[PDB]
Amino acid sequence: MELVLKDAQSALTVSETTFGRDFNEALVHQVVVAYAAGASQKVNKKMYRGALKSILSELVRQDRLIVVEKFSVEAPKTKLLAQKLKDMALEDVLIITGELDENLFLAARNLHKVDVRDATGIDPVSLIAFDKVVMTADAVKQVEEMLA
Amino acid sequence: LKRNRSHGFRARMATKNGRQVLARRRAKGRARLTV
Amino acid sequence: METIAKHRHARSSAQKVRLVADLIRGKKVSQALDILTYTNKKAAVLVKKVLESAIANAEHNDGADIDDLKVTKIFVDEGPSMKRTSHITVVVSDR
Amino acid sequence: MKAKELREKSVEELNTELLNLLREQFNLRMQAASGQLQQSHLLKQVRRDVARVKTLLNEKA
Amino acid sequence: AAKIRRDDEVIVLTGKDKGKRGKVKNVLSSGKVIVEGINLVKKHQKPVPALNQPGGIVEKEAAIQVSNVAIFNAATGKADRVGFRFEDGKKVRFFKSNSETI
RNA sequence: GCGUACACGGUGGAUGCCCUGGCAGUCAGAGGCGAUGAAGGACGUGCUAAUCUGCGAUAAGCGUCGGUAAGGUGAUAUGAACCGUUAUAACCGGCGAUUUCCGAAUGGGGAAACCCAGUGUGUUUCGACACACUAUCAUUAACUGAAUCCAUAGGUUAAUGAGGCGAACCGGGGGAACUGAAACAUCUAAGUACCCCGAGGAAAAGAAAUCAACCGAGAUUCCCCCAGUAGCGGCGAGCGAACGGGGAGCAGCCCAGAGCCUGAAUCAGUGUGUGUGUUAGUGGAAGCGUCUGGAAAGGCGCGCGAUACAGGGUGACAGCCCCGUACACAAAAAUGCACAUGCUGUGAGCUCGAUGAGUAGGGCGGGACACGUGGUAUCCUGUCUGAAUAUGGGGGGACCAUCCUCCAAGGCUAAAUACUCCUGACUGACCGAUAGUGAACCAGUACCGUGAGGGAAAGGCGAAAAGAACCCCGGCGAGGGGAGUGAAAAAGAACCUGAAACCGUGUACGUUUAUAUUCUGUAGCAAGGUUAACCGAAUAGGGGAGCCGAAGGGAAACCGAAGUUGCAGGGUAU
């Protein structure tokens, strides 16, 4: 599908199977059950790819995924992140990116409603916990190459 | 005096059984191991 | 008005004290104590003590006219077992 | 207190400690037996002083 | 170190003594504090013929937690927090809220 | 005389709140202590009637150096009495002194906390007090030393090991009954419990005279598959491999004798300084008003901090009550971990040589070898005989040929690995006093058995004892009533919330986890999937020695198939 970066009026194309695949309730239920059990059960890469693609497509169809060119704070202060989130009127969002930023990670550390984690450490529980997810084009392509 | 001769601490210690029984008794932790 | 006098953990059989009290049930306090003065039962002393305590409390706190005081609610309950103990209760009022 | 007696020669330390342990101990025990010495910190201070003086004379010399 | 010590003026924030000021007399080892004229009790002391019995009911002061009383400063008249700083050769407590000097 | 229902009562604890409690796991050190007296007890030490803890007549402690230092003098659990309050109150830590008796207990005796001693030194007194020594076995060294000159046996002295206990692991030597074939023979139980020795915290072993044989893997040490395949058993129950194939680690050794040039890297011990920990600690963010409510931490309004909304408690649910946390710092002296650094002994590399000789093998007599020589075996004896040595041996299907190994009778090698008696920290789709530990409590206590051994029940006042001052009755007791505190006393020390069973009164009326088999659904992809063990700031992603399907079928002449892996469900086999 095609998504809007909402910061530069640039349209980005993504694989249909990722953001445009049908939502398989059984797969998501199985994945969340396995995650809860592991929090020993067999885990497969294909199952994880299917679940992440399904949840991402569902969120896109629900307008729960919004992407930005870059999300960071000029200084390692939580107030900067808080005011930046307030500007967009975002309170319960999941910040996902590529290489971890020391300033952004420090700012988001105390925020209970906001969690920061690496692209490779993405889990469905984090995606479903927060209402919306803020990612970046680099993170989007990283996820796309991870899922192949 | 028969009690001292029979259950005396030294008399018990004179034998290996006395040492092992008193050791396990202490392990249990009784206030009086023999008397 | 009402007056209360009770004893706890009395070292006596509950049934015996109940039977003794039944003799004075529904009777004037003055008449009850006068009759109990010569009673030879062991519980006679206990009932005398409780009634005198009741009248003393009435005269110290309640109003006068203690002679017309009447026996209203006298009972005994089984107590803790260590010869079962008993709890004696007397509620008396002129009315 | 702690260091005032440290500099003194061993002879006077021995004299004072022996005199204390021979006289003050008897006085305080008899007072306690008879009910005197209402304040008990005298026992504490005298016992500590005798212990401190006796701690010397072994490692110092 | 203790933020509250002798010769310190404090106000009880809650516990039937709101808005009343006083001076701390003693602090218990369990964290309780004693301030004259904030909490008067009616201890029913048992009379004794010796030991110079005060007589009748003694209207003394009970012990209250330090956490339930805040420190007072005369610079602004409102209770404020306190931290600790290092002076030229000693460490002393300094209030918060513009850092009033004790 | 009782019953039909209600209210008050007393032995009474079903129910519910958690706790100064236990239990299961994870990450690290330690993975032993001591004759310089191990572990544990007995008795004492407080202004003390008693307990925990500390200590030992110097007794809830002392000298020194650091941190903190204004409350403390340990608490249970109060009272009396103390010091100082800005560095000699008190608290924590390191370094030192003392440390009664029994206890291996070590001078002797002996009944555990008891008795009796001897030798030498100091005693400013020599009545008497303090200190050191006074046991046994074994070894090394020194001095003496009969038979017997020396040397030995014996004696004296200096030094070293052991006097015991400790949960588990390793090897070796023995080791049972219960045991299933409805008992039982070959066997399983089981080489389990148990007894002994050695000493290591990890141990032993640790680098081929290794296996197939004509191709091949190349140290020891642990792990999933192969694999419950072969094989073993009245082929039944049941037991049970690797050559070989992948992961952790992979380092090999040396001298085995001669020299050359040599004190050339390394090792163990011993100073200096650098960095991080152990060993006391420092700093460290931010809020009010009304309402409600005993009290706010309940919620309403608007604020601040957040590297810190992890957590503790504070009159009910706290970021801004604080203690704390994130984070930044800190050692006078002692201490581990790696460095450059001076020194004492080992001490590099090169060449030339042997390859650990009464040794391999062999004879007459056993051990366990399921089998007493029978279809028959390995280390060897009591003793004798007896190989060339690297040009040779073990040997390999014995063989010719060909091939691996050793270079044959020295041992060293931390690495990857089993476990926690105890120590430090964290967690609990674990329990809540009839549970959890036997014991949440003065519990391995009371108590029982003269010993082994067994073994309980017993908790919740009140947030704050602020404990019902006082007055009265009562016997100057016990008990109760007014008054008062207390939110409540339908919270009162016999004190958490509190239903009945039982007994009385008045009221209206009458008298088994787990290993397989099969079927159900659901989901991925597809002739594919799952990857095992492992790597991996970590259920991400890699990693298929390992499993089955499989453009194949068929008779490799010939023609030309869509299965697996997870989840939840059930029945069956013990």
Author numbering:
A (entry chain E): 1 to 39, 93 to 201
B (entry chain 2): 10 to 44
C (entry chain S): 1 to 82, 98 to 110
D (entry chain Y): 1 to 61
E (entry chain U): 1 to 102
Sentences from the paper on this structure:
The E. coli 50S large ribosomal subunit is composed of 33 proteins (L-proteins), one 23S and one 5S rRNA. The 23S rRNA consists of six architectural domains that, stabilized by the L-proteins, define the shape of the 50S subunit with its three protuberances. Here, we present a biochemical and cryo-EM based analysis of the earliest period of 50S assembly, utilizing an in vitro reconstitution system with purified rRNA and L-protein components. Taken together, early 50S assembly occurs in a domain-wise fashion, while late 50S assembly proceeds incrementally.
In order to distinguish states very similar in composition, additional structural elements were added to their names (e.g., d1_L4/L23, densities for domain I plus uL4 and uL23 etc.). To exemplify in more detail how certain L-proteins contribute to 50S assembly, we compared states d1, d1_L4 and d1_L4/L23. Defined regions of domains II and III show density in states d1_L4 and d1_L4/L23, respectively, before subsequent concerted appearance of their remaining densities. Cryo-EM density for the globular domain of uL4 appears early after formation of domain I, while most of the loop forms with domain II, and the apical tip even later with domain V. Thus, uL4 and uL23 appear to contribute to the formation of local seeds to promote further assembly of domains II and III, respectively. After formation of domain I, assembly continues uL4 dependent with d1_L4 and branches either to route 1-2-6 or 1-3-6.
